[PDB]
Protein: Huntingtin-interacting protein 14
Amino acid sequence: WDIVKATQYGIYERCRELVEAGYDVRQPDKENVTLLHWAAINNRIDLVKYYISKGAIVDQLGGDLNSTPLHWATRQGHLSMVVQLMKYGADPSLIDGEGCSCIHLAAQFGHTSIVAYLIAKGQDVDMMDQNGMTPLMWAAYRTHSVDPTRLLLTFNVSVNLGDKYHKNTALHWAVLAGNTTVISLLLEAGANVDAQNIKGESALDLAKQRKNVWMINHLQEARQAK
Amino acid sequence: MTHIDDYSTWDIVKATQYGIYERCRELVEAGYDVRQPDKENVTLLHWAAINNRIDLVKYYISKGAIVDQLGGDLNSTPLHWATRQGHLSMVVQLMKYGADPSLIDGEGCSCIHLAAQFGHTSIVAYLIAKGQDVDMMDQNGMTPLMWAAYRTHSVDPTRLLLTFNVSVNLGDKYHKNTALHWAVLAGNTTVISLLLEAGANVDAQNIKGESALDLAKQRKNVWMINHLQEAR
Amino acid sequence: IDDYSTWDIVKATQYGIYERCRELVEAGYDVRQPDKENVTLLHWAAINNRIDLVKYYISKGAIVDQLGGDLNSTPLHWATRQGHLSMVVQLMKYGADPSLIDGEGCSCIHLAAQFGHTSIVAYLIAKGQDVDMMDQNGMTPLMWAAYRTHSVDPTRLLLTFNVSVNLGDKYHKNTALHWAVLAGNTTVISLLLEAGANVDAQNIKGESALDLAKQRKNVWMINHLQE
Amino acid sequence: IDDYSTWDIVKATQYGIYERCRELVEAGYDVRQPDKENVTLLHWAAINNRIDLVKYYISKGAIVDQLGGDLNSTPLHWATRQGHLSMVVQLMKYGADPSLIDGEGCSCIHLAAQFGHTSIVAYLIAKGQDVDMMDQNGMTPLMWAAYRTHSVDPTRLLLTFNVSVNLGDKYHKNTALHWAVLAGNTTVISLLLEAGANVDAQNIKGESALDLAKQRKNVWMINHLQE
Amino acid sequence: MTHIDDYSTWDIVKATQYGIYERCRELVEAGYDVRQPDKENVTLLHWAAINNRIDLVKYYISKGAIVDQLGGDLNSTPLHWATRQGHLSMVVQLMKYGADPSLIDGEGCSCIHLAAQFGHTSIVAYLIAKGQDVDMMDQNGMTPLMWAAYRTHSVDPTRLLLTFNVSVNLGDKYHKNTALHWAVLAGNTTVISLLLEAGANVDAQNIKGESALDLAKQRKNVWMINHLQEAR
Amino acid sequence: WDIVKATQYGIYERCRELVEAGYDVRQPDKENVTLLHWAAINNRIDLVKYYISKGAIVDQLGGDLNSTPLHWATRQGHLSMVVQLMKYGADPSLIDGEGCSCIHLAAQFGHTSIVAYLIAKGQDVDMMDQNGMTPLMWAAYRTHSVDPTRLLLTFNVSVNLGDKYHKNTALHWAVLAGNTTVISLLLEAGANVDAQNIKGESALDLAKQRKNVWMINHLQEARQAK
Structure:
């Protein structure tokens, strides 16, 4: 196959053949994606080492959303690839076309093991992406599961931060997404039920709007406990 | 939060296992010593950890619980239990309180070895990120790679371990069996494939002069015999 | 959460899903019918602070002081234990008798005292309850708090209601001061001493309070009780 | 901290340094003497929950209901505002009259109501205070809570004490429901409605409650009041 | 916590400046709009920030306060005020809430420039650590180094700035005066010494063809004249 | 002077002269201290760059307490030197002879600006040193000032952790040191007044032992608020 397909499919020998034949590892395709992006998103550990040894730019931006290879690996959820790229100096704090850094991508796609690894390596657990969203907010809005929310709360995130543009706290986002699993976790961690967003709505107002009695009762009870 | 059972009759151990915070706090308030282990010598902290009760773990510790208290049949710490069970958040929490993942359980294993043998890949990565030696040899002379090779018939955690800077050809302190030998002995074809690709020396001999190949032949496993043969 | 509109009456009651509870009772569920554990809907409503369900269930014939649970307690006993003041007030406003006794010989004031529910202790006493009222254990509200609450209140409150400090229970015949010591409650010790507690008073076992402090070897105690 | 053994009587009182306070009063400081702000030591002791100093100062001649501060209030008014139940109980146990009025026409129950102090509201009512008692503003405990407390209580509690929901103050002649709306208190609105509040009742200005909801354009309100 | 004054008569602004949490919460509870600015168009958030009232800042934000609301005579944000005053903890807190340090105040300056001109070295370092460009030119055409050279007659923050990868010979967008020129114009001998040691081009001319030396001579400052002369 | 003194006194030209003359920059002195340690502790920025360019080992352990040059700079409180060494790859998490990493050294000596820089660069705010102490505990025990305690609390540290060996929380340590300034900050941040250390003493027990009425009242009041 062509080098791109060989990379995507992980045919090591074939890639090494074309490269030695003269192919430039920095040569992007039509959509401006580099071989390292394809290797990263497909978890081709050996190919990543090889291409980088051949001069591949580790954090080269590419794709319709100007993302780095590590951004792609994080989205796909390849823990081993995240480790590998970071070993070669990939910077997880870099921002992609959607305004997200690796920690936000890990949180919105529920890749709990990657969230843990990134935090253990120094990533700011309260980091706001360019959309004004923190990892906790993304988890509350996108992951209807105990993790990664539980993990993030264990790392002691700021539970009551409101996103930069809508001032929606993680609790606001959980109510808006009908994420009941996360609501309980947030309330137990001290989420402020009366904090108001830019429209003057508290998470409780949102619960009532949604007409969810279980939510209304829990939020009211949390207030009484606060 | 919501009372869905009559806990006024539940004993401390049961309320801990089920995570009934309020009932545990009550019994401790009544005068129960959080350091008092049950018949099996298990502490409330062990029960809370293996059941992933994060809030209770913090409460018990504030009340006097010994963080790395050894207990149970296997003489292990609450962190060892949390690791075996695979509760990443509990591992994170206990380590925050100072629980030491390098401690040895009653079977000679530290946390990284337990995580490896029970295939808890995310915990293996977290522990390494926190400073644990990827090549740490336990008291059985086994490294995490060896444990994965002998007990995890799957791609991970072997692939993750190999991704870090692991020494593929180390032999265990006693038998001098490499990860490759253990894979053969376990009939773990999945890992054998990963090790060979990683450069495992097919001719490495243990103290019996046996190489990984010699063990494959002795087992008469055609699959293994040819794979290693082609590998070399 | 996962569609509470299909939850059984007991669960709907516990979580306060009013309309689901009304719907099921109207459809035929008797509000007096106990569950497997022998607990009535009123018990579950009271402990979960479901004021609305409490009014509704009682209006349906629910027995207010119906005894239930392993400890044979009334819904009020349950509300008192959890520290729900508004519920204690509501139940009582419906004929709930706080003087009743549970499977432990304790009344509401004793329960409110041993669980540190100060606001309830104050309400019950203002409603009539005797500050020195003893349970079937000879224990007084002061003895309980001194023995179970490591904090200024309810103790300090009780002392305000001019309670007799040197009274002793029946069986063991211990003073609030003896219990405080056994519980290692130095906060209470201070309050009792300033209240004129008898540091030499002996229990029905010979122990003279300070004696227990000695047996406990607690430095703080031995010194303050001595002084 | 920085040697409280040298602090003046007012500061020692505020921080509860008992021995320093006793020392200074015995040395000649009159406990009735007000400070620059015209506040007495009893006021400072009450608001800072200094139960011990309260007993001591009163035993020294301190005037219990002495009016002080810009708002001309008594020590009990201060305790009530801060929500110190044990203090309210203690003061009253010394002749403190909760029915007195401060520089705003408010009594203790009105203060406890507007500041959301449920446990105190319950105590005062059980001690005699009239649930419908109106202040020099014609405001009732229900109107205040409905207007100042965005929570189930004290409102829900008051409703339990069978308070008249359709009563209106003097001046403005507003119902607890009108105030609740103006305050944007949807939690209270619900409680009042279920209590049988008059959604059509008009104020001394013509406003018919729902009217204000319309003027407020609040979607939630307009719908629930309508229904 | 301890009531040491009668706050029942204090207005929201005063209680904010003094950090009387309970009294502020009360007034807001009574119906005060936290977004309502005073006569000078200053918001309660500005007052809380410049007075280092961390707890109030969080409370006001939860109540609806606009984090980067511009206000005051100089049309600045609460973060700008906190930066000018030099409250590192408040800068940290506001940035956690999303306050943007790159925003411009009514005098064309961003936070890094304010920190530099008022000599708040710790804040300069924190902002750079958080991603602010050490060479960021404000709307007056001034970099942090230039501001330090023109306004801080001290070793820091110039030494710290020079420690990062700052471009010593950039000229301001309008006058083309380098940090060296500004130091001369300010008679800041302390900084002149630091710049020369750092490699500042003594012959760099501004748009008037004047070099740092030319300005020293025009000022007839013997000290400066000889120092720069010996430097070149 | 000799090269050591020239380094300590910052005589650049003189050091460069001796080095070019043949002196090995890795040559330690009697106490096993390297030229980089002397340059670091004396804030000699230029000399640090120079010695590293000549092969100096950045994190070389030295001195009676086996510390790195960055450890020395942190102790002395040189923010510029901390920045410089970290720029050259110095690892602040390394442990010195006393079991401390840079963040603990920064906290115990009250170097607030360095604590902030280290955290901004990824250091774990709850990091326990080998003595079982966190930065917050060291600040509570050693710094009788608002900072760095206030700063640490802003970064959302775990307020109730007990040290590994004595189980003393930051609040216990503050009481033991008679650090009233810090006590108020900790209580406001939710410090647990009843948490017990290994001897079964709560911070309140310690306050009573100390016979400090101001402390006793504040801790008791905090309990009532909790």
In short: Residues 65 and 214 of chain C are 45 Å apart (CA to CA). Chain C is about 50% helix and 0% strand. Chain C has one domain: 1-227. Chain C touches chain D through 21 residues (CB under 8 Å).
